[PDB]
Design an enzyme around this catalytic site. Structure first.
Site, PDB file in Angstrom:
ATOM      1  N   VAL A  32      37.463  13.534  42.933  1.00  0.00           N
ATOM      2  CA  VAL A  32      37.405  12.123  43.407  1.00  0.00           C
ATOM      3  C   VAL A  32      38.138  11.855  41.994  1.00  0.00           C
ATOM      4  O   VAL A  32      37.508  11.913  40.913  1.00  0.00           O
ATOM      5  CB  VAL A  32      36.806  11.512  43.723  1.00  0.00           C
ATOM      6  CG1 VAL A  32      36.738   9.679  44.353  1.00  0.00           C
ATOM      7  CG2 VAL A  32      35.973  12.156  45.208  1.00  0.00           C
TER       8      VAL A  32
ATOM      9  N   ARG B  33      46.835   9.789  33.367  1.00  0.00           N
ATOM     10  CA  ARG B  33      46.950  11.090  32.904  1.00  0.00           C
ATOM     11  C   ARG B  33      45.530  12.284  34.501  1.00  0.00           C
ATOM     12  O   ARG B  33      46.404  12.991  34.722  1.00  0.00           O
ATOM     13  CB  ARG B  33      46.466  11.186  31.765  1.00  0.00           C
ATOM     14  CG  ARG B  33      46.583  11.003  30.399  1.00  0.00           C
ATOM     15  CD  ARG B  33      46.376  11.204  28.961  1.00  0.00           C
ATOM     16  NE  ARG B  33      45.584  12.528  28.728  1.00  0.00           N
ATOM     17  CZ  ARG B  33      44.199  12.090  29.507  1.00  0.00           C
ATOM     18  NH1 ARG B  33      43.658  11.168  29.635  1.00  0.00           N
ATOM     19  NH2 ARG B  33      44.206  13.735  28.736  1.00  0.00           N
TER      20      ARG B  33
ATOM     21  N   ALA C 146      45.402  10.486  36.899  1.00  0.00           N
ATOM     22  CA  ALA C 146      45.032  11.279  38.559  1.00  0.00           C
ATOM     23  C   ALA C 146      46.412  12.171  38.701  1.00  0.00           C
ATOM     24  O   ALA C 146      46.494  12.854  40.232  1.00  0.00           O
ATOM     25  CB  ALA C 146      45.953   9.825  39.303  1.00  0.00           C
TER      26      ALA C 146
ATOM     27  N   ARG D 190      41.108   5.823  48.025  1.00  0.00           N
ATOM     28  CA  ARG D 190      39.632   4.994  48.593  1.00  0.00           C
ATOM     29  C   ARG D 190      40.105   3.598  47.995  1.00  0.00           C
ATOM     30  O   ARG D 190      40.681   2.982  46.953  1.00  0.00           O
ATOM     31  CB  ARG D 190      38.740   5.267  47.945  1.00  0.00           C
ATOM     32  CG  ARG D 190      37.592   4.804  48.277  1.00  0.00           C
ATOM     33  CD  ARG D 190      36.542   5.243  47.811  1.00  0.00           C
ATOM     34  NE  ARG D 190      35.943   5.324  46.895  1.00  0.00           N
ATOM     35  CZ  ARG D 190      34.758   6.108  45.756  1.00  0.00           C
ATOM     36  NH1 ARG D 190      33.898   6.591  46.775  1.00  0.00           N
ATOM     37  NH2 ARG D 190      34.564   6.097  44.385  1.00  0.00           N
TER      38      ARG D 190
ATOM     39  N   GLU E  12      27.074   5.816  53.932  1.00  0.00           N
ATOM     40  CA  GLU E  12      26.459   4.424  51.727  1.00  0.00           C
ATOM     41  C   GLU E  12      25.735   4.006  52.565  1.00  0.00           C
ATOM     42  O   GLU E  12      25.906   3.324  51.151  1.00  0.00           O
ATOM     43  CB  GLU E  12      27.473   5.336  51.316  1.00  0.00           C
ATOM     44  CG  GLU E  12      28.256   4.320  50.970  1.00  0.00           C
ATOM     45  CD  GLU E  12      29.682   4.180  50.006  1.00  0.00           C
ATOM     46  OE1 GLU E  12      31.053   3.641  49.899  1.00  0.00           O
ATOM     47  OE2 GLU E  12      29.173   5.034  48.879  1.00  0.00           O
TER      48      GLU E  12
ATOM     49  N   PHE F 220      25.224   9.281  48.374  1.00  0.00           N
ATOM     50  CA  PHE F 220      24.247   9.332  48.292  1.00  0.00           C
ATOM     51  C   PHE F 220      23.851   8.894  47.139  1.00  0.00           C
ATOM     52  O   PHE F 220      22.386   7.866  46.993  1.00  0.00           O
ATOM     53  CB  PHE F 220      23.678  10.479  48.380  1.00  0.00           C
ATOM     54  CG  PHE F 220      23.929  11.483  46.513  1.00  0.00           C
ATOM     55  CD1 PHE F 220      25.544  11.692  45.758  1.00  0.00           C
ATOM     56  CD2 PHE F 220      22.551  10.910  45.904  1.00  0.00           C
ATOM     57  CE1 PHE F 220      25.375  12.393  45.071  1.00  0.00           C
ATOM     58  CE2 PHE F 220      23.478  11.638  44.496  1.00  0.00           C
ATOM     59  CZ  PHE F 220      24.661  11.957  44.405  1.00  0.00           C
ATOM     60  N   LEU F 221      24.888   7.713  46.029  1.00  0.00           N
ATOM     61  CA  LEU F 221      23.751   7.011  45.308  1.00  0.00           C
ATOM     62  C   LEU F 221      24.074   5.941  46.295  1.00  0.00           C
ATOM     63  O   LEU F 221      23.179   4.538  45.716  1.00  0.00           O
ATOM     64  CB  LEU F 221      25.109   7.032  43.970  1.00  0.00           C
ATOM     65  CG  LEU F 221      25.047   8.308  43.110  1.00  0.00           C
ATOM     66  CD1 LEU F 221      25.260   8.635  41.964  1.00  0.00           C
ATOM     67  CD2 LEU F 221      23.326   8.604  42.761  1.00  0.00           C
ATOM     68  N   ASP F 222      25.071   5.400  46.057  1.00  0.00           N
ATOM     69  CA  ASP F 222      25.299   4.235  46.935  1.00  0.00           C
ATOM     70  C   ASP F 222      23.793   3.752  48.282  1.00  0.00           C
ATOM     71  O   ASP F 222      23.668   3.065  47.814  1.00  0.00           O
ATOM     72  CB  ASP F 222      26.654   3.640  47.598  1.00  0.00           C
ATOM     73  CG  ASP F 222      27.435   2.826  46.843  1.00  0.00           C
ATOM     74  OD1 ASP F 222      27.475   1.578  46.486  1.00  0.00           O
ATOM     75  OD2 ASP F 222      28.527   3.536  46.394  1.00  0.00           O
TER      76      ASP F 222
ATOM     77  N   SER G 224      33.282   7.749  33.345  1.00  0.00           N
ATOM     78  CA  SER G 224      33.858   8.269  32.403  1.00  0.00           C
ATOM     79  C   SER G 224      32.621   9.566  31.723  1.00  0.00           C
ATOM     80  O   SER G 224      31.215   9.265  32.943  1.00  0.00           O
ATOM     81  CB  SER G 224      34.198   7.694  31.209  1.00  0.00           C
ATOM     82  OG  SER G 224      32.763   7.301  30.286  1.00  0.00           O
ATOM     83  N   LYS G 225      32.159  10.367  30.565  1.00  0.00           N
ATOM     84  CA  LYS G 225      31.412  10.820  30.333  1.00  0.00           C
ATOM     85  C   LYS G 225      30.432  10.400  29.703  1.00  0.00           C
ATOM     86  O   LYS G 225      30.415   9.678  28.679  1.00  0.00           O
ATOM     87  CB  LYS G 225      31.450  11.960  30.010  1.00  0.00           C
ATOM     88  CG  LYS G 225      32.733  13.268  30.606  1.00  0.00           C
ATOM     89  CD  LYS G 225      33.157  14.534  29.645  1.00  0.00           C
ATOM     90  CE  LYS G 225      34.063  15.200  30.282  1.00  0.00           C
ATOM     91  NZ  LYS G 225      34.105  16.774  30.284  1.00  0.00           N
TER      92      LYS G 225
ATOM     93  N   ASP H  92      29.725   6.762  38.887  1.00  0.00           N
ATOM     94  CA  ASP H  92      30.484   5.557  38.912  1.00  0.00           C
ATOM     95  C   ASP H  92      29.520   4.514  39.395  1.00  0.00           C
ATOM     96  O   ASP H  92      28.312   4.231  39.091  1.00  0.00           O
ATOM     97  CB  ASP H  92      31.439   5.557  40.370  1.00  0.00           C
ATOM     98  CG  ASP H  92      30.560   5.886  42.175  1.00  0.00           C
ATOM     99  OD1 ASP H  92      29.550   6.054  41.741  1.00  0.00           O
ATOM    100  OD2 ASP H  92      31.409   5.897  42.840  1.00  0.00           O
TER     101      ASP H  92
HETATM  102  O1  LIG Z   1      30.609   9.450  44.573  1.00  0.00           O
HETATM  103  C1  LIG Z   1      31.476   7.957  43.857  1.00  0.00           C
HETATM  104  O2  LIG Z   1      32.066   7.271  44.757  1.00  0.00           O
HETATM  105  C2  LIG Z   1      32.172   8.972  42.643  1.00  0.00           C
HETATM  106  C3  LIG Z   1      33.354   8.811  42.776  1.00  0.00           C
HETATM  107  C4  LIG Z   1      34.191   9.144  41.171  1.00  0.00           C
HETATM  108  F1  LIG Z   1      35.202   8.585  41.279  1.00  0.00           F
HETATM  109  C5  LIG Z   1      33.806   9.435  40.141  1.00  0.00           C
HETATM  110 CL1  LIG Z   1      34.356  10.224  38.935  1.00  0.00          CL
HETATM  111  C6  LIG Z   1      31.556  10.122  40.139  1.00  0.00           C
HETATM  112  C7  LIG Z   1      31.506   9.546  41.089  1.00  0.00           C
HETATM  113 CL2  LIG Z   1      29.408   9.367  41.124  1.00  0.00          CL
HETATM  114 MG   LIG Z   2      29.866   4.912  46.689  1.00  0.00          MG
END
Ligand SMILES: O=C(O)c1cc(F)c(Cl)cc1Cl
Ligand SMILES: [Mg+2]
Ligand SMILES: [Mg+2]
Ligand SMILES: [Mg+2]
EC number: 2.3.3.9
Length: 716
Positions: free
Chosen positions: A117, A124, A126, A328, A423, A449-451, A609-610, A622
């Site tokens: 993703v 760059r 993508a 997305r 999510e 899982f984070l959302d 980003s990092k 994200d």
């Molecule tokens: O979980 C996501 O939606 C997600 C999508 C991304 F493109 C990046 Cl770089 C990091 C995450 Cl954690």
């Molecule tokens: Mg999400």
């Protein structure tokens, strides 16, 4: 203004032009008819869109009141469950069914492997991601900590032979594990030849073929002296490159130069949580990149072409050189002033995304001079991932939206396929029904899982203090959520038909850890999982060679491993769970997390980003990281775990650290010490103090506003 009037809509000129001059040509769609469709679709679907959002609010208020109206300390699950049923939160489970989605590419139906993703606004990245279908195993091993930097194999400014030889050995072992010889090991190979359509591997003392000659897929160069040998295992290709003249090849016992893995089988080009796009100019930049990808002419340096081989028999053949692309879209919540109506009200962004990313995707179904030379889907599908949906009615609505867009676009119905993110809690506990609502469009489900954790916290905000953020990933609710998602996909017939996906590995530098632990995902029956980079795609590909996902899925068939009660187990902390030092640590952790992300988002329009965390581990998260942290702190504020002074002081301590962490950045502007002057700092503070009041804990309304504020200040 500089808007174009089309019925009730006033379209930003930059968007109108981009669509007319770049997107429309080559589609054969009538421009005035396209824009007529936009006005009609927006007019027709906006009320239902709004109604669904209001329904989320209505539901949440009732849950809030239910929690606030009791004193009973441990949650009465029977009562909680019947309450959720009564209010239409928990819907009845439909009978068994099988999805009927058709015309789907083999990368999605059949091949199990890494899914990359990337933010669509970064041309760059993508481009790199699209090209990450094939990746060097050697580079991935040499360049990461998968090979330890022991006091003997430390990376220098130049090639370390000790390190290189370990890379070689590791790959030889992977070869033995993945495509075994009928006798002996690849570690002792001295050469490769193709004899009678059979791979012949020279040992010191014999020749041997493969245990399964069927894993031999082809070669390049002369069969008497191949330039490379193509193999296959679990549907994924492995290519051994042969070049004794090469820097690495000369040191190799069989002249092997590299091993190339088919890695990122699919890629999701992201307009949602990994990007910062708050107005028409930002959307256009994203739309233009998605267009370049679908035409095949995006360059920033160019997209790879397909790969030519010789079949074991002698015929020629060709393999896809590019990752198969999803896009997305944003979800149902936000509006964007890219288009406004007569009243000046912003138009729903998700509706626009479906229209514009859908239109653009037509070019990926064709190959010409106006359409560009490169094909995405050979089977005629457009793949849209739809995030942040809450329940079956919201899934149904996306499917109706896609139907309406298909009509505007002149596409066959069901061309636009849906990748459903699981999510949000109300989707999780109604997942079977959400799948049924998209039964003829769905090509994946995936545990975001984070959302999902952010939604978990916000939904039960009034119940009590939640466990710490690090604790969430091992709580009962989330482990059931993960298993339940796999169960639902498989029962709906996903095996051989649609992807069952799991979440992103965020620690970009911890590749040893990734290789050690991320194998759990295909072991749990996920036919795909998220990686953040091409290097991570290559390394995660190792897992699919080790785990036979198709067989794992066959074995999970029919089993029900999570109960509704397990899904509904709220992650409440036990009483007196934390010492005061641990409370302080969690607050600092979350404040740093918010500041670190918000500062790049608000000031530089960077959404992924990092970002070094509090202990300077590099995470590529994200926007969902903000949802979790802001909700957790809001939850702790709400239940008296911490005070408002605690929060302000942590923000004030963490801000200079975040500044320091960004020192190597030319465009960076520090937050400390004038916190009231920093739009970034105030956004962070606002996310926390207004956290409990945000709809389902979503961060976009605040973030977008604050980013727009920053752009406006900058414009003078
Ligand atoms: O979980 C996501 O939606 C997600 C999508 C991304 F493109 C990046 Cl770089 C990091 C995450 Cl954690
Ligand atoms: Mg999400
Ligand atoms: Mg094209
Ligand atoms: Mg096997």
């Amino acid at each position: 203004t500089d808007r174009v009037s089309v019925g009730n809509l006033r379209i930003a000129r930059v968007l109108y032009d981009f669509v007319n001059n770049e997107a429309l040509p080559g589609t054969d769609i009538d421009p005035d008819s396209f824009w007529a469709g936009v006005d009609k679709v927006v007019a027709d679907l906006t009320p239902q869109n709004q109604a669904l959002l209001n329904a989320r609010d209505e539901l949440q208020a009732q849950i809030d009141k239910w929690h606030r109206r009791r004193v009973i300390e441990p949650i009465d699950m029977d009562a909680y469950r019947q309450f959720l049923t009564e209010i239409g939160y928990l819907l009845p489970e439909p009978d068994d069914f099988t999805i009927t989605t058709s015309g789907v590419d083999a990368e999605i139906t059949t091949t199990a492997g890494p899914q990359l993703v990337v933010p669509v606004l970064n041309a760059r990245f993508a481009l790199n991601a699209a090209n990450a279908r094939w990746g060097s195993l050697y580079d991935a091993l040499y360049g990461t900590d998968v090979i330890p930097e022991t006091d003997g194999a430390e990376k220098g400014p130049t090639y370390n032979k000790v390190r290189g030889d370990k890379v070689i050995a590791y790959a030889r072992k992977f070869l033995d594990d993945s495509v075994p010889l009928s006798s002996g090991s690849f570690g002792d190979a001295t050469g490769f030849t193709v004899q009678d359509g059979q791979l012949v591997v020279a040992l010191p003392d014999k020749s041997t073929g493969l245990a399964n000659p069927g894993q031999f897929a082809g070669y390049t160069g002369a069969a008497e002296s191949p330039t490379s040998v193509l193999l296959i295992n679990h549907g994924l290709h492995i290519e051994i490159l042969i070049d004794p003249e090469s820097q690495v090849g000369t040191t190799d016992r069989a002249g092997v130069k590299d091993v190339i893995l088919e890695s990122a089988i699919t890629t999701i080009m992201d307009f949602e949580d990994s990007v910062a796009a708050v107005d028409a100019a930002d959307k256009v930049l994203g739309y233009r990149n998605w267009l370049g990808l679908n035409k095949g002419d995006l360059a920033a340096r160019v997209l790879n072409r397909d790969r030519n081989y010789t079949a074991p028999g002698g015929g020629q053949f060709t393999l896809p050189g590019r990752s198969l692309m999803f896009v997305r879209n944003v979800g149902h919540l936000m509006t964007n002033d890219a288009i406004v109506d007569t009243d000046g009200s912003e138009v729903f962004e998700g509706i626009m995304d479906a229209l514009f990313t859908g239109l653009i995707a037509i070019h990926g179904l064709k190959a010409s001079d106006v359409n560009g030379p490169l094909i995405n889907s050979r089977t005629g599908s457009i793949y849209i991932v739809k995030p942040k949906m809450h329940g079956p009615a919201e899934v149904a609505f996306t499917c109706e939206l896609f139907s309406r867009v298909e009509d505007v676009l002149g596409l066959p119905q069901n061309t636009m396929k849906i990748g459903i993110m699981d999510e949000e809690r109300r989707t999780t506990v109604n997942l079977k029904a959400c799948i049924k609502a998209a039964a003829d469009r769905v090509v994946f489900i995936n545990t975001g899982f984070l959302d999902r954790t952010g939604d978990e916290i916000h939904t039960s905000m009034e119940a009590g203090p939640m466990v710490r953020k690090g604790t969430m990933k091992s709580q009962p609710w989330i482990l059931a959520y993960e298993d339940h998602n796999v169960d639902a996909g498989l029962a709906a017939g996903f095996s051989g038909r649609a992807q069952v996906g799991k979440g992103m590995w965020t620690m970009t530098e911890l590749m040893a850890d990734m290789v050690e632990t991320k194998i759990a995902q295909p072991r749990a029956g996920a036919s795909t999982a998220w990686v953040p980079s091409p290097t991570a795609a290559t390394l995660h590909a190792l897992h699919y060679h080790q785990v036979d996902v198709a067989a794992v899925q066959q074995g999970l068939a029919g089993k029900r491993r999570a109960t509704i009660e397990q899904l509904l187990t709220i992650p409440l902390a036990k009483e007196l769970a934390w010492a005061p030092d641990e409370i302080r640590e969690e607050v600092d952790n979350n404040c740093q997390s918010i500041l670190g992300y918000v500062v790049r988002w608000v000031d530089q329009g960077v959404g992924a980003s990092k970002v070094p965390d509090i202990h300077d581990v590099a995470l590529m998260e994200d926007r969902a990281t903000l949802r979790i942290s802001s909700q957790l702190l809001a939850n702790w504020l709400r239940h008296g775990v911490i005070t408002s002074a605690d929060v302000r002081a942590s923000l004030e301590r963490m801000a200079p650290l975040v500044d320091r962490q960004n020192a190597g950045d030319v465009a960076y502007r520090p937050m400390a010490p004038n916190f009231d002057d920093s739009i970034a700092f105030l956004a962070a503070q606002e996310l926390i103090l207004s956290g409990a009041q945000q709809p389902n804990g979503y961060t976009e309304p605040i973030l977008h506003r604050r980013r727009r504020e920053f752009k406006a200040r900058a414009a003078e």
